[PDB]
A paper describes a structure:
Here, we determine a cryo-EM structure of the Cullin 2 RING VHL (CRL2^VHL^) ligase dimerized by the VHL homo-PROTAC CM11, wherein one CRL^VHL^ acts as the ligase and a second VHL as the neo-substrate. We were curious to explore the ternary complex mediated by CM11, a homoPROTAC which dimerizes and degrades VHL. The molecule, developed and disclosed in 2017 by Maniaci *et al.*, consists of two copies of VHL ligand VH032 connected by a PEG_5_ linker. Towards this goal, we expressed and purified the Cul2-Rbx1 scaffold component, and incubated it with VCB to form the pentameric complex VHL-EloC-EloB-Cul2-Rbx1, using the short pVHL19 isoform given that the N-terminal residues 1-54 are predicted to constitute an unstructured flexible tail. The resulting sample was applied to copper Quantifoil R1.2/1.3 grids, which were plunge-frozen on a Vitrobot Mark IV and imaged on a Glacios 200 kV with Falcon 4i. Subsequent data collection of 7,216 movies and image analysis resulted in a 7 Å resolution structure (**Figure S2**). We also noted that only three lysine residues are present on VHL: of these, one is inaccessible at the interface with Elongin C and Cullin 2, and the other two are located on alpha helices furthest from the dimerized Cullin C-termini, mapping to a non-ubiquitinable ‘dark face’ on VHL as modelled in our structure. Given that CM11 indeed degrades VHL, we sought to rationalize how ubiquitin transfer could occur in this complex. Interestingly, at the 2D class level from the cryo-EM dataset, we observed some particle stacks which deviated from the 3D consensus volume, suggesting conformational heterogeneity in the sample and thus more opportunity for VHL ubiquitination than suggested by the structural model (**Figure S4**). Our model shows how CM11 folds on itself to mediate VHL dimerization, and how the PEG_5_ linker must cover a long distance to allow for the two VH032 units to achieve their ‘crossed’ relative conformation (**[Fig fig1]**).
Residue numbers in the entry:
A (entry chain C), E (entry chain H): 62 to 76, 78 to 202
B (entry chain J): 17 to 45, 58 to 111
C (entry chain I): 4 to 222
D (entry chain F), F (entry chain D): 1 to 59, 61 to 88, 90 to 103
Write the structure that this text describes.
């Protein structure tokens, strides 16, 4: 369902205002995800894309969600006056719980998650990482 | 307007009522005592409220919420406690 | 530092506040300072949450609170309109204050451990020990429905239908009681996302349209 | 610009935001609203430095030194009758890191 | 010197035949290296480039040199019968010395290199973490 | 297909490649050319299994089991009259891994 419109009309974009290594992902013409080159904290890239193409942004290491233009998804519009579209990528409001969980997933190896001194559900919250595919069902 | 939050070590944190109400748990629980939250965690919980308030939908680029590792675990408890 | 508190302090204080629950002075000030300081210490008590023990005795207390209220209405079937409804209010205002207070247990213990109602109906489990591990307010209302509304429904309906039929006849029945009893049929399923009004429509609205037709047909 | 603070005095701490342009005395009114102690009965310090009532918080509490996520300390000492108590029970220390961290 | 020619004439290419995660690099119009999306072991991509653009390939973890069609560098050509040009990316036959250095470089944390029971020049050998700019200088 | 071998006998080892389709006897000719012992006076083993002269190396030396970088062992036992000596002094073991490895 979430598969890029094959318009073939170019649109240039300027892409990172977050303490993350952003991974840009494009959703292809058939709906399959394709990862593009990563952007370190504070970096800019001018890039070429196309009108009605579906982009989303994640953290490259941990797969976490990142916002673009204060929203969850980005689509190139028209390059009016030939000007490239801006894609200002930033952190979402993460919960205090998750801001803490990020930290736990990053220090402990997955094999030792069920050894932690917590109730079952907090293991099941650890083992449900930021799975991109499940967010595509949420966006659909 | 304010509310009082008292750590396990008796430190009393007085915060903007609104900042406190940020927590689903504090909303649940105006002088709350936290026999299980020592003043280093509580002060950072208060920093998080202050942070969330100041940086939630702010024009200035959002800096990462720094958390010290040692308190990350106690603050995780307080976060999972507070929600 | 994150620590354990025994259920006896937390729970019996809770129980007292869940009985006192008809009012929120104890929520706004006392639950902020005193009540929650006890139960929050325990709910996700650092080494192990006594949130399970608390939920269990809270449920048994709510069942006993609702059964005490139910007894008072079962023999007082005329009072089913006044009392099953007003008791629904004392106890449901309670479910709300319980849930202000309990938003910690509710979030930190109950929801983290909370198996979906579909998981429990199609054969799975670890929450419905004695009622599903629902928020205390949802648990309270589920218990109110199961123990007050469902057993008293035939009397509640019959009385409301007679009182309204008498209103159509020109009598002035207790309007506030009638409206409150009717609202209780709505709130007792407010937690069900698929159909929050089904119970009210099948149990009260269908019988009500039928008696109203027979009244205007005669008029 | 908002300045984020911890107004600390013995076992007291006040987490609140105030403007960089706001004064020590206005902060004492906020503290009054909090601890029910009037400003004359308060001595505020920027961290541990005694601040005069007419000074702005900017005069070192800046939005980036008194930050939301890393607030500056505003010492508070209350006045027991004629004089101010000695200026902060520090916050408790956290426990040691488990081997796995 | 070594830089892509701004021909603006398009070319389609098929890009791995190794047990490594390949990192393609494009040498821009100014000669500066711009990294592109990786290819894991045995994977393919059909990609769009331009005639007279300069490509090279490294490893994604170690920055090791890799070959494309037995050559160190690749340049796209005109698509005869519309068919995409094949870039078969492989390992070189390294020196046995370089092969030993790889294994040591990737296991041991650099601070401990000067701590090893080896002759002093081998530290100097190990401390070339296969520099791409030095290899641009080498190819110039 | 090339099959890479280690024709090993006691402390001796011969590194050579032969075709998957080549015979045990042809390998014994390679060994004869090297160790100056005639083929009948050689018992070749695929690893430790006794091989018959007419068998192809494929019949377990395959290019992917007898690989250049991980050759199969071809045991060799020399002839003691009518009989073969007992079949390979193994190669020495490596030292323990340094802690940094």
């Amino acid at each position: 369902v979430l598969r890029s419109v094959n318009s073939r009309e170019p649109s240039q974009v300027i892409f990172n205002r977050s303490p993350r290594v952003v991974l840009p992902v494009w959703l292809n013409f058939d709906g399959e995800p394709q990862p593009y080159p990563t952007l370190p904290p504070g970096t800019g890239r001018r890039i070429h894309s196309y009108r009605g193409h579906l982009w989303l942004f994640r953290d490259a290491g941990t797969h976490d969600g990142l916002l673009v233009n204060q929203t969850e998804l980005f689509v190139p519009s028209l390059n009016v006056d030939g000007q490239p579209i801006f894609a200002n990528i930033t952190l979402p409001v993460y919960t205090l719980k998750e801001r803490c969980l990020q930290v736990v997933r990053s220090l402990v190896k997955p094999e030792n998650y069920r050894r932690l001194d917590i109730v079952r559900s907090l293991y099941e919250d650890l083992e449900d990482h930021p799975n991109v595919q499940k967010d595509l069902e949420r966006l659909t | 307007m304010y509310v009082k939050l008292i750590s396990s070590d008796g430190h009393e944190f007085i915060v903007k009522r609104e900042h406190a109400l940020t927590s689903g748990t504090i909303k649940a629980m105006n002088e709350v005592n936290f026999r299980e939250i020592p003043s280093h965690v509580l002060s950072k919980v208060c920093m998080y409220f202050t942070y969330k308030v100041r940086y939630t939908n702010s024009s200035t680029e959002i800096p990462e919420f720094p958390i010290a590792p040692e308190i990350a675990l106690e603050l995780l408890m307080a976060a999972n406690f507070l929600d | 530092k994150p620590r354990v508190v025994d259920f006896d302090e937390t729970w019996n204080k809770l129980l007292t506040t869940i009985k006192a629950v008809v009012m929120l002075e104890y929520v706004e000030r006392a639950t902020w300072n005193d009540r929650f300081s006890d139960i929050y210490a325990l709910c996700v008590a650092y080494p192990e949450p006594l949130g399970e023990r608390l939920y269990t005795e809270t449920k048994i207390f709510l069942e006993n609170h609702v059964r005490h209220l139910h007894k008072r209405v079962l023999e007082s079937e005329e009072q089913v309109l006044v009392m099953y409804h007003r008791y629904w209010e004392e106890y449901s205002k309670g479910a709300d204050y319980m849930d202000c207070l309990y938003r910690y247990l509710n979030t930190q213990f109950i929801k983290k451990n909370k198996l979906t109602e579909a998981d429990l109906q199609y054969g799975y489990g670890g929450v419905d020990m004695n009622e599903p591990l629902m928020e205390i307010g949802e648990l309270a209302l589920d218990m109110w429905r199961k123990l007050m509304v469902e057993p008293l429904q035939a009397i509640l309906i019959r009385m409301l239908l007679r009182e309204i039929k008498n209103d159509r006849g020109g009598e002035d029945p207790n309007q506030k009681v009638i409206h409150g009893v009717i609202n209780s049929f709505v709130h007792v399923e407010q937690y069900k996302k698929k159909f929050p009004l089904k119970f009210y429509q099948e149990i009260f609205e269908s019988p009500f349209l039928t008696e109203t037709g027979e009244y205007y047909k005669q008029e | 610009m908002d300045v984020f603070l911890m107004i600390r005095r013995h076992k007291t701490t006040i987490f609140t935001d105030a403007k960089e342009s706001s004064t020590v005395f206005e902060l004492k009114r906020i503290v009054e609203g909090i601890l029910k102690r009037p400003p004359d009965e308060q001595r505020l310090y920027k961290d541990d430095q005694l601040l005069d009532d007419g000074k702005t918080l900017g005069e070192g509490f800046t939005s980036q030194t008194a930050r939301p996520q890393a607030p500056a300390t505003v010492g508070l000492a209350f006045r027991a009758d004629d004089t101010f108590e000695a200026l902060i029970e520090p916050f408790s220390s956290p426990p040691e890191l488990p081997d796995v961290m």
